[PDB]
Amino acid sequence: PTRTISAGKVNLGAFRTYPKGYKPPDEGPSEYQTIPLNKIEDFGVHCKQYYALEVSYFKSSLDRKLLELLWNKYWVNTLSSSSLLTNADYTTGQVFDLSEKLEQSEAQLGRGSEDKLAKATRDSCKTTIEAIHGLMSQVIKDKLFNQINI
């Protein structure tokens, strides 16, 4: 839910397990996701014990009609989002994890895996990009409703 809000895009996955002893095929596209360090070990241990299904969504004819008519008034809610403080704890949690990821990437360069810094850079990029998008909506609101005067 946290990433859904922060990214402005639904973060959902559908999965099915393999029976004990059964080996998966060559297939496994694996769309990249930032996994926090406290979870990455367990993720890696069990990632090949299941597979991901192709997810799609649907709505009814009435849902279609109602959602267009809902939009005729729901537009107001898009210009009053306030996403930066709704789930503020997520970005802080990610930064808290990012710092330990950067500690590990520093330890990798120290003496002597496959480029932890680039992974950490993509994570910090994603988190920052989401934060700037939040500010973009805030500035847009400031431009529309505050910079008008008498």
Partner 1 sequence: DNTIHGRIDQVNQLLELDHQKRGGARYTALDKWTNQLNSLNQAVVSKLA
Partner 2 sequence: FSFKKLLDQCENQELEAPGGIATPPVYGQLLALYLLHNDMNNARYLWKRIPPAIKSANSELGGIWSVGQRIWQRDFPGIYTTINAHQWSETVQPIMEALRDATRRRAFALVSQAYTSIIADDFAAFVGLPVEEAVKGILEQGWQADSTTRMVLPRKPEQQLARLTDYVAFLEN
Partner 3 sequence: AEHLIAQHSAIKMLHSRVKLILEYVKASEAGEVPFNHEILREAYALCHCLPVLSTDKFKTDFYDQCNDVGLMAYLGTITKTCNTMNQFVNKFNVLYDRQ
Q: Which residues bind partner 1 (CB under 8 A)?
A: 88-89, 91-93, 95-96, 98-99, 102-103, 105-106, 109-110, 117
Q: Is 129 in the site for partner 2 (CB under 8 A)?
A: yes
Under a CB-based contact definition with an 8 Å cutoff, are residues 55 and 14 in contact? yes
Q: Is 148 in the site for partner 2 (CB under 8 A)?
A: no
Q: What residues between 11 and 70 interact with partner 2 by CB under 8 A?
A: none
Report d(CA 102, CA 121) in Å as an integer. Answer: 9
Name every residue whose Cβ is closer than 8 Å to that of residue 97 and which is 6 or more positions away in sequence.
Answer: 36, 37, 38
Pairing of strands 15-17, 50-52: antiparallel
* Shortest distance in whole angstroms from residue 12 CB to partner 2: 23
Stretch that binds partner 3, among 15-23, 25-33, 59-67, 125-133 (CB under 8 A): 125-133
* Shortest distance in whole angstroms from residue 113 CB to partner 1: 16
**The three-state (H, E, C) secondary structure of 34-54, written as one string:** CCCHHHHHHHHHHCCCEEECC
* Shortest distance in whole angstroms from residue 139 CB to partner 2: 5
Q: What residues between 20 and 39 interact with partner 3 by CB under 8 A?
A: none
Residue appearing with tokens 């802080």: 92
